[PDB]
Design a protein around this ligand. Sequence first.
Ligand SMILES: [Zn+2]
Length: 152
Amino acid sequence: GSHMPKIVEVNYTWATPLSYNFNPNMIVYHHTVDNNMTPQKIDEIHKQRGWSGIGYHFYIRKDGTIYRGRPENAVGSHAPGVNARAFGIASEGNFNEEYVTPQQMTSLIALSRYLMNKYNITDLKRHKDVRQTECPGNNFPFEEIKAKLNVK
Ligand SMILES: [Zn+2]
């Protein structure tokens, strides 16, 4: 059946109760702005902001490594107003000033197709499509991702 790319599991200690009332029908793409960040650093920041921990379901570093964030069946903390219906995929970088690496692109396509097939998702969105933000940055290759995934 449909292939799952390599997802690195990360040991988190969740501060507040996770909700599993999560029914995804959307994928939302993010950038981190700051570089150099481990998934554990993101988790620390999101906890400061009052979230249980890392708000993204997945975090893709510059070398293409895909780290798990929130459990795949839990509500995240990445796009208030669509969190109960959206996977959140963050890429390491500030794409107002950077481009995604080739390894990030490879991982973005493989991970998106995995989620789309597993959950019957066709709706791809940038953070800035659902909320007022510059995320995921001017250079984020959204139209190219949609083209490779055959989404109109
Ligand atoms: Zn964002």
